[PDB]
């Protein structure tokens, strides 16, 4: 018949068998994650073997149906997903070598130690030893030997592997009609959907650059406030108009500035709002936390949790001797089976992560109506943005008062509110230049615009100019400091952390305007707005069945990234920061080095 008639029939066979094999892998992996067992490791790996094998043959078959021969977009979108397969095109010897490199990098990253020059008996792994330093130490020299040792022990080992990684990954990518490996990664944002919902892979760079330009003023002022407060701790080594030295940033890479809060808090005489104590005095348990998250989604008109959700989840660490993995996850096991795995504790943190993880489950439930292959977030950024805005609402003092964890007469001081926004910014605004600059480097390396003889030269040029961060020690081309971060050594794209941050405030602002919340965006709670819930469901139910541009338009009214909601969220902190900075320099010189003398 038609190519399209055959594709539909092909997809129908795929869907029915894929839903079996995918479900059995989910079930087997759930058994392992809720009972770590050498047997459950076997059952898990075999279920993933059957599922991987089938999925691979089926991607090959999908290529027999040329997309140009296919009218229906829903059929087209499913085939498109199937026939982006990977390094299958790569020769067997090159494919075997790429995997060798990939595993070697991951293993020297996960096992490398760094020894104290002061005590050779003290050789720490990143976790827990070096992370403890980089997140807690206020001693310039301690942080420095941790920071430099890591980038020299493991980073130097990674250097020649990463050169071969780029060459091979690029070879695979070009043999798949992609310009380079970076252009392949930008594939996740491509949209060839209806009307003016189309989006090219090259547009992503343009949109990440236009939006970043709009964020830099806010960042520059956050950067100058933090620089001034770090002068009070490292007077010898902080220049009032220079970049910040890279090892003083509160983690190994400066990826987040969250751990600079004790050094930089605006009003250290004010405590954080922390309803943990109220939860213990009201005798909350894990069941009460998830019951309250459930009430929240029902208040905006979304479904309850399923009965199997309550019966089959693991909302509490087991005490039957079963060893489990405690990291919080939300599971869409297939065939109507939705679960959460969490070692829930009676704290404000775990109360907020439960709303976050239940947000994932709500997205999963909404797009279960879609065909198997379209059962996902509109793009790689959507799922977390959705989970995150549930946290934003659940944490607001308005919501905590309605829930009863805050007294009905509670009033937030302007100082407490500035304290809170500043902590938000150290995490949310602080990572935006880091994230953009990292992926911009990788994009340019894959593109061949940064030759290997200039890799570390350009890495630190862009870290100085874009991030305002300067290396404490010069680093020649024996180094490979980008690979010294987990995601780079383990072959994960990074731009998702940038885009989801922008989406999340676009989502939150559009729902808050729908709920007709008046006042500052950062105080908004969408609870009890069924209008807001409907607008939300308009997007969630689509899954990946439409261009992400249209999915975005359904909830926020525009079809692209816009940073104004992010800036609106932080506008109180912004005008405060400008006042604080009025007698200091704002911006930074790209020439001063901590080692220039």
């Amino acid at each position: 018949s038609t190519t399209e008639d055959l594709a539909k029939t092909f997809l129908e066979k795929f869907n029915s068998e894929a839903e079996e094999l995918s479900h059995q892998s989910s079930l087997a992996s759930w058994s392992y994650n809720t009972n770590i067992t050498d047997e459950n490791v076997q059952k898990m790996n075999e279920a993933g073997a059957r599922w991987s094998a089938f999925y691979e043959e089926q991607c090959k078959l999908a290529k027999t149906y040329p997309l140009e021969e296919i009218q229906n977009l829903t059929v087209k979108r499913q085939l498109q997903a199937l026939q982006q397969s990977g390094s299958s095109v790569l020769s067997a010897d090159k494919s075997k070598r790429l995997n060798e490199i990939l595993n070697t990098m991951s293993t020297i990253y996960s096992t490398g130690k760094v020894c104290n020059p002061s005590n050779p008996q003290e050789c720490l792994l990143l976790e827990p030893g070096l992370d403890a330093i980089m997140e807690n130490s206020k001693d310039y020299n301690q942080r420095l030997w941790a920071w430099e040792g890591w980038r020299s022990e493991v980073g130097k080992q990674l250097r020649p592997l990463y050169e071969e990684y780029v060459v091979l990954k690029n070879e695979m990518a070009r043999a798949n009609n992609y310009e380079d490996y970076g252009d392949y990664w930008r594939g996740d944002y491509e949209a060839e959907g209806p009307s003016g919902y189309d989006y090219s892979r090259d547009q992503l760079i343009e949109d990440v650059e236009r939006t970043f330009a709009e964020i830099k003023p806010l960042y520059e002022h956050l950067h100058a406030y933090v620089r001034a407060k770090l002068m009070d701790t490292y007077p010898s080594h902080i220049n009032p108009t220079g970049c910040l030295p890279a090892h003083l940033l509160g983690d190994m890479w400066g990826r987040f500035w969250t751990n600079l809060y004790s050094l930089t808090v605006p009003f250290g005489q004010k405590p954080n709002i922390d309803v943990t104590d109220a939860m213990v005095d009201q005798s909350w348990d894990a069941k009460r936390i998830f019951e309250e998250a459930e009430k929240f989604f029902v208040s905006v008109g979304l479904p309850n949790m399923t009965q199997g959700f309550w019966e089959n989840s693991m909302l509490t660490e087991p005490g039957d001797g079963r060893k489990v993995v405690c990291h919080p996850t939300a599971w869409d096991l297939g065939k109507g089976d939705f679960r959460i795995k969490m070692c829930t504790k009676v704290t404000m943190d775990d109360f907020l992560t439960a709303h976050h993880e239940m947000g994932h489950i709500q997205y999963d439930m909404a797009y279960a109506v879609q065909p198997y292959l379209l059962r996902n977030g509109a793009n790689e950024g959507f799922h977390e943005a959705v989970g995150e805005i549930m946290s934003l609402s659940a944490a607001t003092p308005n919501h905590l008062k309605a829930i009863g964890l805050l007294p009905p007469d509670f009033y937030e001081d302007s100082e407490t509110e500035i304290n809170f926004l500043l902590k938000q910014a150290l995490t949310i605004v602080g990572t935006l230049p880091f994230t953009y600059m990292l992926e911009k480097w990788r994009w340019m390396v894959f593109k061949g615009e940064i030759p290997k003889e200039e890799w570390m030269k350009k890495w630190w040029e862009m870290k100085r100019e874009i991030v305002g961060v300067v290396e404490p020690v010069p680093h020649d081309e024996t180094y490979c400091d980008p690979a010294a971060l987990f995601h780079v050594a383990n072959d994960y794209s990074f731009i998702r952390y940038y885009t989801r941050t922008i989406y999340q405030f676009q989502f939150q602002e559009a729902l808050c305007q729908t709920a007709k919340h008046e006042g500052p965006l950062h105080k908004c709670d969408i609870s009890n707005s069924t209008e807001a819930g409907q607008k939300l469901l308009q997007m969630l139910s689509l899954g990946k069945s439409e261009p992400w541009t249209l999915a975005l338009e359904r909830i926020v009214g525009v079809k692209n990234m816009d940073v104004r909601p992010l800036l609106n969220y932080f506008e109180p902190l912004f005008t405060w920061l400008k006042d604080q900075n009025k007698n200091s320099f704002v911006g930074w010189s790209t020439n001063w080095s901590p080692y220039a003398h």
């Binding site: 055959l6 092909f10 079930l27």
Partner: protein, 188 residues
């Protein structure tokens, strides 16, 4: 009449090879059926559920099978979908009652129950009350299959997977379709 060997039967049929039992020459008590509240679906077509207990009919057919909870909507006149089109079809002029109940406790196993099947492909839609039990390879394109699976050549049956942890829409439902014929024969 012996509604108890169909309804409370131990084993049920896959939807594609659905079972049929003739009920005739029979003292017919329909109150016991609509008095049991285990049934999740009890839609009647033509006849009224209570008013059914006082009507007399020429013969009664009791078709029984197992499907997924999501598909119980298809066992109704005027429906489309894989079940209504390829497995069990009700006439637009149907007179009778569709009775369904969740059977997760019986029909779903840990690790999965794959014994219940449904037909995935067919060259055309079933006629009302047709029963296709063939297993010829479905030939989707011009190239022939020669009795073996291959490119564009699919085995036409497919298993349900019934694990007890499935959501309600994916849980096994036992269905009984009661067909009442009124004219062109004497009553029974």
């Amino acid at each position: 009449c012996p509604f108890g060997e169909v309804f409370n039967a131990t084993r049920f049929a896959s939807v594609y090879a659905w079972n049929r039992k003739r009920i005739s020459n029979c003292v017919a008590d329909y109150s016991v059926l609509y008095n049991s509240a285990s049934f999740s679906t009890f839609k009647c077509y033509g006849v009224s559920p209570t008013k059914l207990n006082d009507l007399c009919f020429t013969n009664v057919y009791a078709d029984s099978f197992v499907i997924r909870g999501d598909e119980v909507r298809q066992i109704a006149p005027g429906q489309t979908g894989k079940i209504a089109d390829y497995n069990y079809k009700l006439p637009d002029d149907f007179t009778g009652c569709v009775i369904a109940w969740n059977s997760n406790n019986l029909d779903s196993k840990v690790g999965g129950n794959y014994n219940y099947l449904y037909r995935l492909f067919r060259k055309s839609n079933l006629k009302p009350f047709e029963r296709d039990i063939s297993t010829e390879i479905y030939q989707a394109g011009s190239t022939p299959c020669n009795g073996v699976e291959g490119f564009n050549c699919y085995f036409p049956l497919q298993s349900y997977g019934f694990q007890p942890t499935n959501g309600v829409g994916y849980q096994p439902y036992r269905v009984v379709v009661l067909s009442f014929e009124l004219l062109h024969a004497p009553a029974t």
